[PDB]
Amino acid sequence: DAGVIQSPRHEVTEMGQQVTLRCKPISGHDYLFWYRQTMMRGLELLIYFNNNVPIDDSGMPEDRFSAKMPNASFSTLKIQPSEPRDSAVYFCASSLWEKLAKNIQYFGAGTRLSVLEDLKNVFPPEVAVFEPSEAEISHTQKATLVCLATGFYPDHVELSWWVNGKEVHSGVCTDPQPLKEQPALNDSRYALSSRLRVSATFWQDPRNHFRCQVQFYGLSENDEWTQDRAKPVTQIVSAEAWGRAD
């Protein structure tokens, strides 16, 4: 159950710096694989190791990329200097001969890497939470909440819904992709909706406790910042509402 561990889960960084991706394979596994996946190239093997030794590195970029496995429990992949085109999801996997014979390997959760030209483009989400119309609950006897996170860049957000201090899963639908709140070009902040649909007089019950929670990944403390804007760090921004039968 306790599988491949990758670190960090997210990284948002400025071009020109060294990036280190880390992986611990499942204990006892003696193969470890590094892949990347982008929009432009799809899914690709960078390197794999066996017994700590690199076997096939034909997929490694020709110079800023280097991979090591100092011992059977730890592999790193390093990019130096990093460039915007390195932005991708990087996955690590591990396996064993008998599983690889049936073409089975086990994947970590990935590292999502954004390498940006300029950190002054980074913005955390403004999170607005709208209210059920009277009509829609007058007509259909249920009530839609709408959460709107806007103006965030890059797109490393993870939205959840919480009811009385428990994350809920049933009832929820979040867009699978962000919308670009598109001024023409690519440097362009993003927006995203989610809904949570509720039984009659859950919404009307003035007592009911609701929140759209949104994790943003952005700058870290060892990033420099000197805009008058608040430094757009990794943070949870969030909105809420109570029931209103009034």
Place this chain on the structure above:
Amino acid sequence: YQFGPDFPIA
């Protein structure tokens, strides 16, 4: 041409 990719350990 060798058998591959490789062998299981003993």
Place this chain on the structure above:
Amino acid sequence: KEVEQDPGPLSVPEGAIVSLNCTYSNSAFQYFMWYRQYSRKGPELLMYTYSSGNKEDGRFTAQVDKSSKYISLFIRDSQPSDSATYLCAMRGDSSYKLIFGSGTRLLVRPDIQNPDPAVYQLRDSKSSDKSVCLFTDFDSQTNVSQSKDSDVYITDKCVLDMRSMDFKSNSAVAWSNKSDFACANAFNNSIIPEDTFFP
């Protein structure tokens, strides 16, 4: 070592048979696999074949034709939860390195027996109120287009599995602040059925 795969996207109705395929050129590939990837997640192995024809597991059938260098996956009785990107991959016997196709996105549209194409309006929990227009409860016949200016005309579209009730519904969301922005007017590039409310 190039494998070609059509990106789609495929949109099919629940219950439909889907056909995915890839072609390739390297006669040395001998192991052929299919993976499903849900969005913002890792790939999950579905089926694997050594050279060698066709195999069946549940609703899935994988096939390989090494002369035409053409492989496919068939999914019977497609379900909404099969919605995902589907990727083929392959290798030879000299390395565990996998070569993947670029993937095919599949959307299976849920069957929604009690449609009730409602729009609405709604405003924030703040003193401020710009609004939205929630187009909810339509059926999976109605594709939605937003059009745009570089000035604001902004919208998306998704499905919720309301559990403990045995319900489910489509909901989408549109907004802008063209201030002469109207719900009645919202979705004018989107072929809707008939409906409109009002405060």
Place this chain on the structure above:
Amino acid sequence: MIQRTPKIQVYSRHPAENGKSNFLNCYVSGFHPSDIEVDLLKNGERIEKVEHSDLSFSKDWSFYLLYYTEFTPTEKDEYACRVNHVTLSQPKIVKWDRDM
């Protein structure tokens, strides 16, 4: 553990003719384990340029190697192979007999 001592054959590639370039061979086979020292000797003295085949082995798992060098046989020069191996308490010297 099982040890097997090496069989040694010393011989020329071509029929020997005094004054003519040839190759001197020392072939060791049937031995285990594989570590082994082999020198070709000219009147008792090591020949320095000696080459060998890549380590391989027979059906019974025993190893074999060919050591060899260019040489010009003469009437009076004595050539020999000298082998050492863990099964030998001291090196084994086998004289080249050009009739063999």
Place this chain on the structure above:
Amino acid sequence: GSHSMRYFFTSVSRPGRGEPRFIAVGYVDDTQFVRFDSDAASQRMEPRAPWIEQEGPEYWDGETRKVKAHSQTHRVDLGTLRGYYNQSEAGSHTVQRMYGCDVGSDWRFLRGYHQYAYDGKDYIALKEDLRSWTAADMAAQTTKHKWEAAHVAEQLRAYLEGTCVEWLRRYLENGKETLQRTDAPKTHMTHHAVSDHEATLRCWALSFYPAEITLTWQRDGEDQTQDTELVETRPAGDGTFQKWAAVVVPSGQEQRYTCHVQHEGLPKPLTLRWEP
């Protein structure tokens, strides 16, 4: 005639030296065509016959990768087997693996094989059916149980019956000048006195390929394997082989003895008799 392709892998532990010495060689019939040595500079599979030189970049990368991967499992194995036998870390030990395939003179599959030895002794081997394993002792049983659970045998069998023989056929065609040649033996006889009621006749075959050859002595047309004497066939170093056989005979019986040479290069078996 029949043909074979065979690969031989040897690793020797070297306590205090760190990594084991790993050496691998491939053969078609009696002709070597590749090698790898963990201690050489290249760290690549290297060609050793001219006909394999024509293989492209992909081939060599593939072979290099498989052979290096093989050295790593041999290295694990040396530690694993040391444990199985409870042996000191101070000693040097040896693991050997051999595998290959034969074809008939029609070049269809005759048989495949795959065998493994620990310190120069049989350890585990795939039986001829290519579906089952024979293990020499309980260490080997433990390996057998792992390899059965892993379905190693099925992978091997698909290789030996398919890929191995396909590539063997390919090498025989590409190397037909080397590999499909026969070089008939050049033969002669020597005479040396001994005992003084006895002399030694030695019948020589030089410069022949393939290595396979049959020398016998006859006394008056009668098979004479009775104090007769055969050296092991030995490589000349130029791709050919050499062999002799000896018979010790009463002096003045010389003419009664004949040497019979059989070899694929010989449209007819040669008879030799002490001449002058």
